[PDB]
């Protein structure tokens, strides 16, 4: 999937 | 575009050769964002997307990288005619930035899943005509550098990206989309969002990158995921080494989230002779306090997640309390849903699971339990106080009855004798900022908490069932 770069958590 | 001195390290045959390239570029007047993003994307493609044939490292030949570089620069130079947009005095115009944003946007595949992994780099843009949300903003900044527009820089909040430019770097422009089913605002400033005190625009305490920090962003944007269960060790190592390179040069000083990321990688695989993860998490918090008015949420979330993973209940609760003390001074707005989801998961899943285990361990005779520590009960109360204060003055509510059962359960995990020790005072000792928690003070020390009364106080609900 996609997470904003360097957001914490999984 | 590519100068002779940029080419001498190719071919890149290892992680360390990629690090050497980054070192060389970070030593130049301005690191070449296009070169570096193409290299990362190439290496990521062959280590995470398609590992067929891999024996050690995907060798990056100059001919291959230069041809991708040339495709990018040809596309941007041909589509953006600079003569149409005269530049006074090292300053780009809003019209020029919008033109570059339109060229990138208009190049993308008509229809694709925007939420995929591995679509962050200029390698994805060239080979797949696909970019994720923040990738579009990075690509606009890389295009602007390739055009000679030294004043155009990446701006980052904790959940969005845009650009700054112009006289003194003081202008802002939207260049990409945010979230799912929001309306484009490309070309516009971020001033309405700053004025409304949303988390998305950090009350104006967002990051204004220089070129070195744009390099740090692309490094943080590396995605080692191969699938849901497997990461590339190679890409983890590369990311970790590049982050230390940037750290040593000073380029993470103003980048809290990168410091958290580095701490996370050190916990997974410690580098001998480097700072502990905790030191790095604290450095991230210090960066937010020093450069961003202590208006960031994620420095504290990074710290809390580390304590949670290590089942340090006390320190996890303290860091989530600190998280909530930041959010309390924001207004919850329409496009802040990601941080609502994070608070919801902590209050209604993560904390309940931590306290359930703590309850079992206390039953088995644990000593020094968070459940027998009034300071830990105070941190739980401070967490909810900050969320209630966040809701005050907001255009959209936060709390609802689906929070209330978890609050009652969590409160109940501390015995009355522990709860009684906290002294709640007006302006272990705790002061509440929120009107909702002030009204709940009375209920917090009974041996058996009054569930219905708590529910009434936490929510907009003011009546009970008629029959």
Author numbering:
A (entry chain B): 6 to 15
B (entry chain A): 2 to 53, 74 to 386, 399 to 460, 549 to 588
Q: What does the article say, verbatim?
A:
pmcMenin, a 67 kDa protein encoded by the MEN1 (Multiple Endocrine Neoplasia 1) gene, is a chromatin adaptor protein that interacts with MLL1 (Mixed Lineage Leukemia 1, also known as KMT2A) to regulate the expression of multiple genes, including HOXA cluster genes. Menin has been identified as an essential oncogenic co-factor of MLL1 fusion proteins found in acute leukemia patients. MBM1 binds to the central cavity of menin, utilizing Phe9, Pro10, and Pro13 as energetic hotspots, which occupy well-defined hydrophobic pockets, and positively charged arginine residues (Arg8 and Arg12) that are involved in electrostatic interactions with the negatively charged binding site on menin. Importantly, recent clinical studies found emerging resistance to Revumenib treatment and patient relapse as a result of somatic mutations in MEN1, leading to point mutations of T349M, M327I/V, and G331R/D. Understanding how these mutations affect menin structure as well as the interaction with MLL1 and current menin inhibitors will be crucial in the development of a new generation of inhibitors maintaining their activity against menin mutants.
On the contrary, mutations of G331 to arginine or aspartate perturb the charge in the MLL1 binding site on menin, resulting in decreased MBM1 binding affinity. The crystal structures of G331R and G331D revealed that both mutations do not show steric clashes with MBM1, and the side chains of R331 and D331 approach Gly14 from MBM1. Surprisingly, in the case of the G331D variant, introduction of a negatively charged D331 resulted in an even more pronounced (10-fold) decrease in the MBM1 binding affinity. The structure of meninG331D with bound MBM1 shows that the side chain of D331 is ∼7 Å from the closest MBM1 arginine, Arg8, suggesting relatively modest favorable electrostatic interactions. However, analysis of the crystal structures reveals no clear rationale for such a loss in the MBM1 binding affinity to meninG331D. We have also calculated the electrostatic potential for the wild-type, G331R, and G331D menin variants and found that in all cases the MBM1 site on menin has a strong negative charge that is minimally perturbed by either of the two G331 mutations. This analysis suggests that the electrostatic potential in menin is optimized to match the charge of the MBM1 motif in MLL1, and an introduction of either positive or negative charge distorts the charge complementarity between menin and MBM1, leading to a decrease in the binding affinity. However, reduced binding for G331 menin mutants was not observed for the longer MLL14-43 and MLL1160 constructs. This indicates that the presence of the second motif, MBM2, compensates for the partial loss of the MBM1 affinity towards G331 mutants. A similar effect was observed for the competition with MLL146.
